[PDB]
DNA sequence: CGGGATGCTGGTCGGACTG
DNA sequence: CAGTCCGACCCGCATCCCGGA
């Protein structure tokens, strides 16, 4: 299929992307290679069918065009492809398909003769909250599913090696099914691009997925949800996702590598419905990306404020050790609980099922005495997001106690 | 030049190493490829001169031999090499040289069709001490120079990539001069081998060497000095055997410019080892490495240090505040005074008086008082020769002397 | 300095080859 | 007769050498 090759198609002539460079004189140079199909002294339009079956007396011609900054163009002689290769085998190529292969050959080699390490993948700062600025952009944010697998970044070392490394900046062993497909895909795409994704196979626990990724069965898939260039880390998230989609338009025959579906939302409610939907399809949640977010690598565990994860909260039990009130605004005068981690380190937990009138009334009517006799030392189940690395649970809310009490009635 | 190719030479026929395999029946199979040079219907001996100039009407013949466990041998047809390649260019090969290239081709491909990640480099436990067990082995230990550079392990990923990683298990950028030569060297050597060495360029500070190794834009001026090798499937292999394999690897290619084997020295006693250490310091190296002859390769998994290597280097210098004194507990150190300095973190450690006899250490610990020490030694600054920092206390610490010099034997 | 030619390794294809 | 080896064919990466500026 055409458009699997990089470049623009126009007036029946397909041209690969111009490769620009500087010369000794300091002027700008451009070099372009182009493919055309000639039958009966006529350039005919290129069709997807002629990649499977030849057309009678059609000849493919390849030529290059070269010119300095605002100078006259120079053309090469036409190399005529009149015949496919591996002509007897199942490897056989059509004339047209073989010409594009030779064109992409000369193109990739020209790029190599006239032209990179591991970058830590970007990390998500926000958790079940979407900053209002996400919907103040000219473009709507993107929503993606949140797969509970193992994270991996792909790149090509320039010598030709495909690098698959981890969130801990560690190269992966095995995954030959994926590295094989990445080697194929990198012939058709810019070799400097980093592909950022998740190793995963659906309906499988993370212990199994992490088991295959770390160990040295070729059954995992690679779901790419982002890309970036080392020299253009400020490129907006939106533009990075159009480029990523042009990369995957090229190859749709891949079996183990997949682009992650992108969803547009205009408000928080649209986003929370997609998060609901992905949980029922068995995923871990949703990812929200600001449309103008740059690529902020996670150097020294840095989290970007232009992504948000939408996940369900974790469950745990803690010992209630004290109570207090909120400080800021509406939370001022509203009661908060103080649980404690086994390290005697303590944290605030928010009553989830009480109105603000209750939180005000409860903090007014409670005494150190009545809390020592009825609440101290009780076990309290706490929905929380993450543990601050401090170990403190973040965004902690009290679901309820084991032994059920009504705190409104305590005397 | 012949011995640049793996295999044995005998009766004028060179044969590459047998590649063994299993069959469905479970019997052992062996496959061998061999090269011979025939002139006038006679196998003539292969010479290094035939790699630069052809011999008239000599033809090189390549053939394979294949046989199952204790079964009759099967022979292939002879592939005749009558002509070198790149015949007009400076790339030209002789007939004989071209045949060995084609043999090593079929050999490497057969090995690939019938057949690995980072392992943390092994770490040195002992410091300016050589255990007596090093000299109880059937073979004498090996001493090497200690280059103050950056450590690196080389291996080949099997797909064809050359991996150069660090002690931190992190792949290196740049070093194209070194990776280029490793790719050429790995055509002739077992592809399963790890080469363990040091990135270095002599008479240059470590800030510069580390500067070129870490950055992705080095000037391609560093060298790679290999001092060990290992196989993932045979980490119990004794140090001695690993160094012959390593030396056979480097016998092959001596044309390399950026890759070097580290000179091996035999010693029979501690004094022999310390003279080599002295000698390397005067040539500007950091010290010596001592390897027990039967030491396996123990990778530094959780910063694990192997008790079958020892470094011999000069000690570091520092100043600490004297805060207390005590005595030794074990044997000859019993009743002998020790000082107690303190790190800025208020953590304290024992320092040994270096220039006092044991009679002095006994007398001092008997005659000293908390009073006399609080008034003349407490809080003073004391220079301390030490080895390393315990992962923070200085280890093997010795007192050179104080800033303001006092004679502690005369304190009253 | 751009590119054809040459040779190399790794990939796939297809036809023996042999227990 | 089931892998099991291997020549053949392509292709990306090197180097060598000769136009092409
Ligand atoms: N489409 C996606 N976009 C971004 N991240 C995704 C996506 N699908 C799955 N993920 C995973 O979610 C993680 C979000 O980054 P974050 O810093 O939140 O990780 P974490 O909190 O340490 O791990 P977890 O999110 O599992 O608790 C990434 O590491 C990635 O592996
Ligand atoms: N011939 C050699 N054999 C072994 N190690 C060598 C040799 N030459 C230099 N070295 C270096 O000495 C180091 C000894 O390992 P060790 O665990 O003692 O390192 P370290 O103590 O953390 O670093 P340093 O030795 O610089 O203090 C190796 O990492 C290696 O880089
Ligand atoms: Cl040396």
TrEMBL record, chain B:
The ATP-dependent DNA ligase family profile domain, residue ranges: 215-343
PROSITE patterns tied to this protein = DNA_LIGASE_A1 (PS00697), DNA_LIGASE_A2 (PS00333), DNA_LIGASE_A3 (PS50160)
Q: Where in the cell is it found?
A: Virion
Q: Which InterPro entries did the record assign?
A: DNA_ligase_ATP-dep_cent (IPR012310), DNA_ligase_ATP-dep_CS (IPR016059), NA-bd_OB-fold (IPR012340), NAD_dep_DNA_ligaseB (IPR050326)
Can you list the GO cellular component terms from the UniProt entry? virion component
Q: Which GO terms describe its biological process?
A: cell division; DNA recombination; DNA repair; DNA replication
Looking up SUPFAM superfamilies in the UniProt record yields:
DNA ligase/mRNA capping enzyme, catalytic domain, Nucleic acid-binding proteins
Cite the Pfam families for this sequence. Answer: DNA_ligase_A_M (PF01068)
Q: Which UniProt keywords apply?
A: ATP-binding, Cell cycle, Cell division, DNA damage, DNA recombination, DNA repair, DNA replication, Ligase, Nucleotide-binding, Virion
- What Gene Ontology molecular function terms does this protein carry? ATP binding; DNA ligase (ATP) activity
- State the protein's purpose: Very low-fidelity DNA ligase that seals nicks in double-stranded DNA during DNA repair. Together with the viral repair DNA polymerase X, fills the single nucleotide gaps generated by the AP endonuclease. It is not essential for viral replication and recombination. Displays a very low adenylation activity towards DNA with 3'-dideoxy- or 3'-amino-terminated nicks compared to regular nick DNA.
Which family is annotated? Belongs to the ATP-dependent DNA ligase family.
Query: What is the protein named?
Result: DNA ligase
